[PDB]
Amino acid sequence: CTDWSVDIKKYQVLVGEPVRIKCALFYGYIRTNYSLAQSAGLSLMWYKSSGPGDFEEPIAFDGSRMSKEEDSIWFRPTLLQDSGLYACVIRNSTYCMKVSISLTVGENDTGLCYNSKMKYFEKAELSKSKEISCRDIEDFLEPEILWYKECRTKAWRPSIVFKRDTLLIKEVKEDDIGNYTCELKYGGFVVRRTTELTVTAPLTDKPPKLLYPMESKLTVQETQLGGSANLTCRAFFGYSGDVSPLIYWMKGEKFIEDLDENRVWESDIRILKEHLGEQEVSISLIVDSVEEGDLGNYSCYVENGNGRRHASVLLHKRKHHHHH
Amino acid sequence: ETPPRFTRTPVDQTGVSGGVASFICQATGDPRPKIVWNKKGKKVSNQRFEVIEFDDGSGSVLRIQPLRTPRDEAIYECVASNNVGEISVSTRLTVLREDQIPRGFPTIDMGPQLKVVERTRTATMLCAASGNPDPEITWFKDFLPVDTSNNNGRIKQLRSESIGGTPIRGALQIEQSEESDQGKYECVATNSAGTRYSAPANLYVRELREVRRVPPRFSIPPTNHEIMPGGSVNITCVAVGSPMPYVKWMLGAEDLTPEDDMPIGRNVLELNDVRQSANYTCVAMSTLGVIEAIAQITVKALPKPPGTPVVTESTATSITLTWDSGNPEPVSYYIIQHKPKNSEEPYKEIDGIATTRYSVAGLSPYSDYEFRVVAVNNIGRGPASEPVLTQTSEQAPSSAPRDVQARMLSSTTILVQWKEPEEPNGQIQGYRVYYTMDPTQHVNNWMKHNVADSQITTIGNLVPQKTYSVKVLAFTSIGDGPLSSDIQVITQTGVPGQPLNFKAEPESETSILLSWTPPRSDTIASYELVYRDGDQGEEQRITIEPGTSYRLQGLKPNSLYYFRLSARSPQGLGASTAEISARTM
Ligand SMILES: *[C@@H]1O[C@H](CO)[C@@H](O[C@@H]2O[C@H](CO)[C@@H](O[C@@H]3O[C@H](CO[C@H]4O[C@H](CO)[C@@H](O)[C@H](O)[C@@H]4O)[C@@H](O)[C@H](O[C@H]4O[C@H](CO)[C@@H](O)[C@H](O)[C@@H]4O)[C@@H]3O)[C@H](O)[C@H]2NC(C)=O)[C@H](O)[C@H]1NC(C)=O
Ligand SMILES: *[C@@H]1O[C@H](CO)[C@@H](O[C@@H]2O[C@H](CO)[C@@H](O)[C@H](O)[C@H]2NC(C)=O)[C@H](O)[C@H]1NC(C)=O
Ligand SMILES: *[C@@H]1O[C@H](CO)[C@@H](O)[C@H](O)[C@H]1NC(C)=O
Ligand SMILES: *[C@@H]1O[C@H](CO)[C@@H](O)[C@H](O)[C@H]1NC(C)=O
């Protein structure tokens, strides 16, 4: 019997709302639908494991709460003991295949309506339009959606066009940050799907900004031979999305890492200041044994999807004391 | 000695920044070639570059992780070399940033997870990747490439069916897992755009299961039945095993319990109206095979007819019959119907014969009967056996010949005729005349004649004026019936036949009237009237006139007197009528 293990699509849900677990195998893996499987004289069976690896009991149905309509299972409502893996089996007598589907029955976080560990995630920009959706509902399908903010019914400002399953902030403010939990009726029961909104500055269109060192000011660092050297670049990035900042050093036409052999190397990019969602990052050059050898031109390079800016520093030594 | 030659050449690759790229070089030669990885002819070594060797002295893999762009972006080469020759192969490497990952580039949506199978058990690894065009899936174990060339073997590759819409599914199937299979596995998704790795998942392998699963098996099989047409019956089926199987009832192909609701382990069947016969299947299925077991439900309605209704003994008034039961099943008893051959009247019926042999009594001798046999049990009378006809053969006549009569023809010859017995009792094979000239001899010395169903015969050569005694019997093929007698006749002229409708009535206390009918013979002299006072009287004769009736006078009141008639012709005396007696008033 060909086992496909746990399916990609997980089912998570708050103790007390209805849930319809479709069998994944029809909707992806295998070619046909349910009715045809029956026609060809195949059996459909369900088993329930409590996790891996507990042995699967063939799951005892009533008809009220835990029913078995055609190719899925219906819970109404969900119960804490309902959590687990639900194996879904199909069979000729020369043919056997099953997949597991994962179901997590969770509880509201202390004082709230949502579960803190069980909410979606979205992001938006100031002065630009975001459309929060209410997703994965499709099985319950234009009824009334009651949007809450931090689990409290509020009076919404005029820039917010509620349609059916959506809501559209035509101009996003900083206040818009928070936990939008939407609510829906069916069953009759109550289902909740909550998404946390974080907002950022708009998409920067300018190349980053050097600090240490300035893009014009040829600044110089003193060092003596045999000492160790710390050339700490410091630059500023406008919000460029999830893309990690691109800041790096160079010596002439040599890139640092290749030159080394464990004497001269680039650190790990520290984030010094992070704020919705623009950053002030830092990466430093490190020279262990300062030869003659290393002295001279080291340029810090900064770059995003808007251009490439570099600044230049100097590595050198102080001569004899004020004796001239 | 042979120079080195490639068994596997590296192919170009295109990976993604902060990801993985792998290159493969495997080679054969004598002696075993050493392998070196070059960037522009120079044996490169680099902490971001790792070289892994195959357990067999073959080749090696170059792995670069995490990818850095555009540094790594360069032309590399594989070189295999021994002191017998040298070989090299070129290949190109490209690395991308995610800021310009093409639309339709592979992405891992879900990667393999830690799995623990026991040794010699089937392990399956799972993966999820998407892309446009559709991604190719490959596998690595402990950094080395698997490749299963023969696709049939302990280790085989499974593939998803691409419905137009979903991520590509993909798996690695390992029959009979062994400890060599232990290690750190990672999967790889490729297409014309580039290559992406999932995250590493370790595989673990244990020695044995505490206990393994149990295939389904019948605790309570489904038991056959006979029932009346439309009765009731509770049929129970119970299956067990681990995991416990479901039990659906089945009429061969079609399923009897509806899929959207199918009970677990214990289904008991309630039946209503079996009219026609049928076959019922009870299926149990766990994940360790499907098992079956059938029940036959049939209704009977009657025994079949017996066979061989054959007679092994017979008598004249009874017949002993035997038959085989003719039936596979338990019949309670049998009933025999019989009536005479060519009779259209209803058959007689005999109840309760508890065996396969029976003697039918109370029959009439030498009489024809037709038989069939039917078996009966508690449902009803079945069809009759094939029929049998049989004649009750009588072993001899049981009555004397009737109407033995004789009359004279010529002077040396007489004519004897008679009619058939009331008890002919068989095919009459003939008749017998015991004629003789000497009515005092023992019978084997009298003289012998023969008739064969002709009712009449003549006997000649008698000498006139002699007493001949005569007696007659009938015989069948088995043997002889009884004798009749009344002849010691004297051989002269022809004689008349005794009258019929002979009766006597007392017209008075001293007178009595007689009514008789004269035969055909017109020439009649007179009739003979033997009267005697009762039984001990004297045989006196009276002269009566040839007419129709006569009046006798001169008798005693309230007294009995016997009388005996015998026609008298002027050529000779005839035959005598039945003995009648009349009482005076
Ligand atoms: C090359 O030379 C440069 C010198 O310019 C070095 O740069 C500094 O390295 C030091 C390493 O110790 C860093 O020191 C750290 O300061 C951080 C900033 O303070 C926090 O708090 C403020 C609130 O006032 C926040 O706004 C701010 O964002 C920070 O979160 C700390 O985060 C560091 O860690 C922690 O230290 C104490 C333990 O004593 C904890 O309890 C605290 O919670 C604190 O978080 C640390 O204190 C310094 O930031 C670096 N400066 C720059 C500009 O990068 C390079 O390290 C050096 N390179 C080498 C040696 O390789
Ligand atoms: C939106 O919901 C999140 C999740 O509960 C809140 O995050 C919490 O913030 C408080 C700060 O007072 C912390 O003490 C909690 O530990 C956080 N919880 C989690 C799960 O991160 C967030 O505060 C909410 N937004 C608002 C405006 O209240
Ligand atoms: C059932 O078994 C047959 C065996 O010929 C196989 O071809 C088929 O794919 C199996 N499943 C269905 C739905 O027919
Ligand atoms: C659990 O959810 C209910 C809503 O059904 C809510 O009223 C309650 O506050 C939640 N529990 C806690 C501890 O907050």
Structure commentary:
The complex is a heterodimer of chains A (324) and B (585). With 324 residues, chain A is mainly beta. Chain A has 3 domains: 1-109, Immunoglobulins (Immunoglobulin-like, Sandwich); 110-203, Immunoglobulins (Immunoglobulin-like, Sandwich), CATH 2.60.40; 204-317, Immunoglobulins (Immunoglobulin-like, Sandwich), CATH 2.60.40. Chain A is 3% helix and 44% strand. In chain A, strands 1, 2, 4, 6 and 7 form a 5-stranded mixed β-sheet that branches. With 585 residues, chain B is mainly beta. Chain B starts with a strand and ends with a strand. In chain B, strands 11, 13, 14, 17, 18 and 19 form a 6-stranded mixed β-sheet that branches. In chain B, strands 2-9-8-4-5 form a 5-stranded mixed β-sheet, with no helix packed on it. In chain B, strands 21, 23, 25, 26 and 27 form a 5-stranded mixed β-sheet that branches. Chain B contains no helices and 48 strands. The chains are: A mainly beta (324), B mainly beta (585). Chains A and B meet through strand 1 and strand 4 of A and strand 12 and strand 16 of B. Bound molecules: a molecule of 5 linked components (NAG-NAG-BMA-MAN-MAN), a molecule of 2 linked components (NAG-NAG) and 2-acetamido-2-deoxy-beta-D-glucopyranose (2 copies). Residues 109, 116, 150, 178-179, 196 of chain A line the site of a molecule of 2 linked components (NAG-NAG). Chain B: Belongs to the protein-tyrosine phosphatase family. Receptor class 2A subfamily. Chain B: This is Receptor-type tyrosine-protein phosphatase delta.
Dominant shape of chain B: rod-shaped
| Count of alpha and pi helical runs of chain B | 0
Percentage of residues in helical conformation of chain B: under 10%
- Note the overall shape of chain A: elongated
Extracellular side (chain A): 1-318
Family (chain A): Belongs to the interleukin-1 receptor family.
Domain Ig-like C2-type (chain A): 1-104, 113-198, 208-316
Subcellular location (chain A): Cell membrane; Cytoplasm; Cell projection, Axon; Cell projection, Dendrite
